[PDB]
Ligand binder design. Structure first.
Ligand SMILES: [K+]
Ligand SMILES: [K+]
Ligand SMILES: [K+]
Length: 49
RNA sequence: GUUCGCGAAGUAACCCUUCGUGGACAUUUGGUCAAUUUGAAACAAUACAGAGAUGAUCAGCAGUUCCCCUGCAUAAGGAUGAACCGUUUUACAAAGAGAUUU
């Protein structure tokens, strides 16, 4: 989490990294965290289908 | 305490003196805070190592950041102040062929 948050802090526009971080939380079975990551990504770019 | 008024005692009687009594004057400070270990300062010390773009030695200026420090500062300086360097899979479809199955 520290790694992913560091990268997203330095470059919030990396939508691929946002998705990979959300998937990492999915693999931890922590859907609340995954949902939060997806929501934050939608806050950055809601147009990315 | 003072002062205005009244009772009284002392004095021959006033002034004056004392005991009693009513009124007037003056009227609510300070704390976000307790005095060493357990509600938060840091440097330093010991060790190792010895600065980005390079084959080598270096000037830099920036940008991004939920890192700031020094400075009066919107100046300048702090290794180009530092961190930056990793990890990376699906709007996934169309046409066709040869093998698999009833
Ligand atoms: K050196
Ligand atoms: K330099
Ligand atoms: K500089």
């Amino acid at each position: 989490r520290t790694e992913y948050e560091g990268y997203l802090k330095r470059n919030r526009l990396d939508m691929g990294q946002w998705i990979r971080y959300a998937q990492f939380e999915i693999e931890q079975h922590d859907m609340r965290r995954a949902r939060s990551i997806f929501e934050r990504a939608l806050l950055v770019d809601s147009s990315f289908i």
